[PDB]
Design a protein around this ligand. Structure first.
Ligand SMILES: *[C@H]1O[C@H](CO)[C@@H](O)[C@H](O)[C@H]1NC(C)=O
Ligand SMILES: OC[C@H]1CN[C@@H](O)[C@@H](O)[C@@H]1O
Ligand SMILES: [Zn+2]
Length: 1014
């Protein structure tokens, strides 16, 4: 295993280092506005060294954006695909590439057999080529790597099954900025090449000058280079035709033959395309070839890629004809005029890369190595696309909840083979596809129109329901004596209970367990732990009485705590935001201990008075002018007081001190240690009154944020033996700090209401001497070093915070982990900030045609980990990566993959069992079974189960951390006959494993294994 901490990789281009050096000046470079006047030597190409040009026809299809997926399919895409099938069938030399398998599958299943056969034929013969082959072209900023893998697998599995092909070249022309998580996953999924387009215009200029637009992209910690994937970065401002034939859009636009009038399109540079004729072909070719030779100067080989396409192009048969015929006339003339020394033809993306590597193998070019990312993107001037790291935060949070529910549903149902009547495969397929669709670069990004966001939400809601059905059926089967197990595959044996989604104050969705001497004395509940190690976590349930005790299934008492159910209200009468306690229901909380990838059953039993092992939280409402807060049967009366500073300590955990406004002010790790200044503060950014306006994509603040005026907020303190918390009703946010004995959990119920042109940010102020350095993660997979650059505007220093960020000095680190992707930064030494929501009244000129005014209450969650790190073995100053501590990684896991909770839905569960998985190996804490998925239906003689195993890398800070068992996923199910290491999508076997043992993987590595069983 490579050491991913101590050796700084030697690469030709390291993006953080490049950023430190680059000046980013936005100077007018001429017709190539963001470049320079490219010059070339006409003698470079000649009879024995021609410029091979591949014109690659494409059609960018967004699976939802201005219309919903189905609306675009009906109005545009089904015509594009039907006409592509006809045109390619009839014109054997025409080519076309396709990326979005969600649309292709939607089309294909509506085709009759004759057409399906014609389609397989043009794919088999190389005319129609799939690029990437993912369900969508995903966002790369907010997406979790697990969902990027999920959607890639969904599309490639469909392609293998129905088209018998697996793309090895990736095409990503629209994500707003690019992540190295893509080559990481692609290279482990059989890919050999990838192409990207949206990178900062300054970076395109810089790499173009050095002919470094094509590079071997390796991971920031990869010293050896085995993660390397050849990447082609396009050079220009757009993937449209005006910005893909060469440097001058006024000339290239003339070669987009769909812009002549009858299609309602034109060239904004005021020179329209002209039909190619025998009389003008030489002059048109003179112009086109000159553009091509200028573009070729920016690369190292004599093979040139010329994309030919735009949004939803190649729709009408007349469009196919006008593009094809005019280009064929140009090719016939150009390839017969020896003086151009050009051979041009339509080609596919793989054809291009194959020729490039033939040139490379012939010793004609060597490519530079590069590590780093391409965030934050700006397409022009100071227009940085950091707004979408936060836009539509409700759905960004929903993405993470469904991410976890899909994993749990697939894992819980994988243990058994199911009868087709159970509809398990059907429900899981729907769930995987709706989540996969939302990874689209206008889905999770929050950049779609309002009715499209609603469509994604409805689809994810149906996916969550499908997951719940599968999980509850699976739990009943896993924990019921087999000879008693009697399933009704449509029956609800259990109801899932989720404390954080949609969340208290967002939707009243949780069921109350109704107990009573006259109706039901007790209730079984079950917890599932999807992680491959024993895990304890506090869980809560709503109950109809505060006098409830908990036992495990051996009837052993389990210590519990009961707290009231508090809900906050913006009281339009008193004009205060204050809490009301329920008089009909209460929260029971206790520590559940669950086996690795297993289940554990507990029982809640009512009693007539306080039970021996249940304690009751005290509650204190701090506010001027209080009124009573009756709590029905709750045994402790609420206390009141004027606002004041308070301190709390749960267990042996940290002691936290709060200001009289209910916000954290300091953390003291142990009773003897210092009260470290750590202060939460809420601020707001506005929008510019002159010039460019922030919108769904762009963050264009009118200067640094201003503090939210807090008034004298109402603060509620609940103190319990197992859990305490401080909650405060601030304008737009009910802010809560919860303590369970370790790093606190922060929950913000964010309701931006009608505050137009406002972005609400949550900032942490410390005295940590971080200077201009901070760390943020990429897709929940790795942490990358960031350096705040004052030569760049505020919005450029904002980065995606898909799951965590931290600052540190030589001795102290503060890590903030998130349960949802949001945008954030460290704008000054000692600070961290992360945006909660943004409401924008204007459109930002990127095509959406609306601002963001559809905000709704969202419950954001976090873990805040303050740690001493002077004893940790950290990377050197020049290393571009950072790594979490064990506590911060576990904290992240508690937000993203919490225990699942199930309430038995009927009165009596006959045949109930206490635990499942007690014999599963408890793997080392840095290892995770990211995916467990049965790959065969029940009629398959040989069953197959796939596993994706990921090992992160955690800092060695002196904790002995020991004794764990090796996890061999191939032996998790009985009767194993074979164990194979496969690509991450499970589509190709890479290694037959001895003894049918799946070895564990190295730090920062991810492997896939498939076990076969008789
Ligand atoms: C398609 O995949 C390869 C062709 O390169 C080969 O296995 C066979 O011809 C096809 N597979 C099928 C249809 O089973
Ligand atoms: O300007 C951004 C838009 C451009 N390309 C389209 O296909 C959209 O997905 C993008 O959101
Ligand atoms: Zn797009």
């Amino acid at each position: 295993c490579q050491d991913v901490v101590q050796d700084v990789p030697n690469v030709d281009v390291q993006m953080l280092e490049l950023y430190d050096r680059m000046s980013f000046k936005d100077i007018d470079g001429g017709v190539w506005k963001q470049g320079w006047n490219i010059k070339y030597d006409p003698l470079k190409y000649n009879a024995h060294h021609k410029l091979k040009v591949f014109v690659v026809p494409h059609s960018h299809n967004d699976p939802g954006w201005i219309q919903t997926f189905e609306e675009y399919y009906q109005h545009d895409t089904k015509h594009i695909l039907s006409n592509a099938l006809r045109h390619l069938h009839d014109n054997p030399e025409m080519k076309f590439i396709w990326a979005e398998i969600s649309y292709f599958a939607r089309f294909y299943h509506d085709l009759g057999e004759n057409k399906k056969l014609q389609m397989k034929s043009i794919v088999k013969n190389g005319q129609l080529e799939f690029v990437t082959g993912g369900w969508v072209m995903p966002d790369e900023a907010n997406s979790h790597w697990r969902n990027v893998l999920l959607q890639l697998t969904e599309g490639q599995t469909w392609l293998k099954q129905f088209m018998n092909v697996t793309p090895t070249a990736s095409w990503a022309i629209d994500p707003f900025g690019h992540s190295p998580t893509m080559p990481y996953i692609l290279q482990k999924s059989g890919f050999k090449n990838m192409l990207i387009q949206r990178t900062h215009y300054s970076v395109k200029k810089e790499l173009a000058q050095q002919r470094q637009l094509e590079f071997l992209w390796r991971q920031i910690w990869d010293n050896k280079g085995d993660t390397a994937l050849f990447t082609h970065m396009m050079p220009f401002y757009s993937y449209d035709i005006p910005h893909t034939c060469g440097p001058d859009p006024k000339v290239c636009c003339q070669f987009d033959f769909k812009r002549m009038g009858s299609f309602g399109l034109s060239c904004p540079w005021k020179v329209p395309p002209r039909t190619i004729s025998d009389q003008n072909v030489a002059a048109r070719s003179d112009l086109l070839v000159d553009q091509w030779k200028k573009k070729a100067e920016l690369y190292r080989t004599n093979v040139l890629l010329i994309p030919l396409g735009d949004d939803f192009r190649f729709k009408q048969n007349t469009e196919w004809d006008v593009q094809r015929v005019n280009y064929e006339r140009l090719f016939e003339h150009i390839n017969s005029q020896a003086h151009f020394n050009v051979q041009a033809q339509f080609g596919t993306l793989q054809e291009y890369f194959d020729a490039v590597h033939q040139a490379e193998r012939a010793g004609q070019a060597e490519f530079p190595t590069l590590s780093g990312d391409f965030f934050t993107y700006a397409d022009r001037s100071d227009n940085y696309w950091s707004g979408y790291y936060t836009s539509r935060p409700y759905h960004k949070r929903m993405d993470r909840v469904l991410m976890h529910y899909v994993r749990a549903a697939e894992m819980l149902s994988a243990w058994h083979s199911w009868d087709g009547m159970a509809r398990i495969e059907e429900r899981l397929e729907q769930a995987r596809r709706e989540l996969s669709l939302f990874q689209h670069h206008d889905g999770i990004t929050g950049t779609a129109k309002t009715h499209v966001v609603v469509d994604y939400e409805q689809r994810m809601q149906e996916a969550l329901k499908a997951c719940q059905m599968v999980m509850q059926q699976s739990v009943y089967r896993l924990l019921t004596k087999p000879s008693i197990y009697s399933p009704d595959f449509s029956f609800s044996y259990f109801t899932l209970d989720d404390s954080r989604w949609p969340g208290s104050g967002v939707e009243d969705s949780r069921t109350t367990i109704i107990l009573g001497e006259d109706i039901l004395p007790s209730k079984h509940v079950v917890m599932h732990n999807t992680l491959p190690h024993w895990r304890e976590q506090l869980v809560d349930f709503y109950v109809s009485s505060p006098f409830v005790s908990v036992t495990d299934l051996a009837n052993n008492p389990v210590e519990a705590q009961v707290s009231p159910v508090w809900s906050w209200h913006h009281d339009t009468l008193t004009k205060t935001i204050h809490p009301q306690g329920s008089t009909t229901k209460y929260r029971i909380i206790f520590k559940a201990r669950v086996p690795p990838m297993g289940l554990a059953t507990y029982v809640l039993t009512i009693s007539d008075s306080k039970p021996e092992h249940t304690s009751y939280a005290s509650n204190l409402l701090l506010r001027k002018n209080p009124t009573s807060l009756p709590l029905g049967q709750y045994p402790e009366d609420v206390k009141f007081g004027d606002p004041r500073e308070i301190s709390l300590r749960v267990g042996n955990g940290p002691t936290l001190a709060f200001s009289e406004q209910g916000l954290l002010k300091s953390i003291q790790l142990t009773q003897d240690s210092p009260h470290v200044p750590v202060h939460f503060k809420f601020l707001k950014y506005g929008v510019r009154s002159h010039g460019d306006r922030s919108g769904a994509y762009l963050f264009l603040p009118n200067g640094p944020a201003s503090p939210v005026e807090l008034g004298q907020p109402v603060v509620l303190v609940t103190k319990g033996k197992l859990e305490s918390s401080v909650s405060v009703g601030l304008p737009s946010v009910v802010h809560q700090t919860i303590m369970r004995g370790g790093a606190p959990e922060i929950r913000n119920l964010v309701d931006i209401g009608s505050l137009d042109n406002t972005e609400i940010v949550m900032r942490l102020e410390t005295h940590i001497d971080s200077g201009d350095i901070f760390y943020t993660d990429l897709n929940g997979l790795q942490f990358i070093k960031r350096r705040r650059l004052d030569k760049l505007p505020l919005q450029a220093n904002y980065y995606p915070i898909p799951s965590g960020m931290f600052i540190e000095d030589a001795n102290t680190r503060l890590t903030l982990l998130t349960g949802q992707p949001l945008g954030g930064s460290s704008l000054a030494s000692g600070e961290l900030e992360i945006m909660q929501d943004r409401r924008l009244a204007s459109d930002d000129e990127r095509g959406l045609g609306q601002g963001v005014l559809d905000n709704k209450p969202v419950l954001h969650i976090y873990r805040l980990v303050l740690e001493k790190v002077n004893n940790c073995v950290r990377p050197s100053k020049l290393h571009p990566a950072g790594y979490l501590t064990s506590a911060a990684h576990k904290a992240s896991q508690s937000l993203l993959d919490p225990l699942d909770k199930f309430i038995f839905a009927e009165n009596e569960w006959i045949g109930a069992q206490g635990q499942f998985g007690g014999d599963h190996p408890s793997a080392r804490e840095d290892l995770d079974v990211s995916v467990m998925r049965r790959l065969t239906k029940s009629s398959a003689k040989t069953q197959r189960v796939g596993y994706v195993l990921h090992r992160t890398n955690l800092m060695q800070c002196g904790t002995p951390e020991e004794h764990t068992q090796k996890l061999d996923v191939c032996h998790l199910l009985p009767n194993v006959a074979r164990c194979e290491r496969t690509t991450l999508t499970f589509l190709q076997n890479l290694e037959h494993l001895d003894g049918m043992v799946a070895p564990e993987v190295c730090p920062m590595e991810t492997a896939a294994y498939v076990s076969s069983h008789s």
